[PDB]
A and B are shown apart, each in its own frame.
Chain A
Amino acid sequence: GGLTCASAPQGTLRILEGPQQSLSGSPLQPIPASPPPQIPPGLRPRFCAFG
């Protein structure tokens, strides 16, 4: 009436919960790159010679 060893298991199942990968879009930056410093339009000379 006691507990005895039974037949060895024939296989093992290991369960884990996993989600999946999306598409590669690689959206690097809101406003991207190093935007260049640049000329103010027209500007004009702010200096003249004497005479």
Chain B
Amino acid sequence: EPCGLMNHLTAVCEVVTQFVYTASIPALLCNLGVTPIDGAPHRSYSECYPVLLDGVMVGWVDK
């Protein structure tokens, strides 16, 4: 009765449990080439990727 519903992790698999700052990441993504949600994407909003980081949309790295 529990088939396919009760699974088990492989030996190498693991759950993430650490918590980090993730505050300097939005400022690094912009150095890398992302353009903030505020504007000037430099393309057409259709040739651009919507960047998300943990629910918060940094916004629109060029394609």
Residue tally, chain B, CB below 8 Å to A: 7
The main secondary structure of chain A at its interface with chain B is loop
Q: Are A16 and B31 in contact (CB under 8 A)?
A: yes
Q: Can you name the residue of chain A whose Cβ is closest to the Cβ of B35? A: A14
Q: Is B23 an interface residue (CB 8 A)?
A: no
Chain A: interface residue total (CB-CB under 8 A): 5
Answer yes or no: A40 CB below 8 A from chain B CBs. no
Is A29 interfacial (CB-CB < 8 Å)? no
Which chain B residues lie closer than 8 Å to A18 at the CB level? 32-33
CB-CB under 8 A from A16, the residues of chain B are: 30-33
Residues of A that sit less than 8 Å from B by CB: 12, 14, 16-18
Interface residues of B (CB under 8 A from A): 30-33, 35, 40, 42
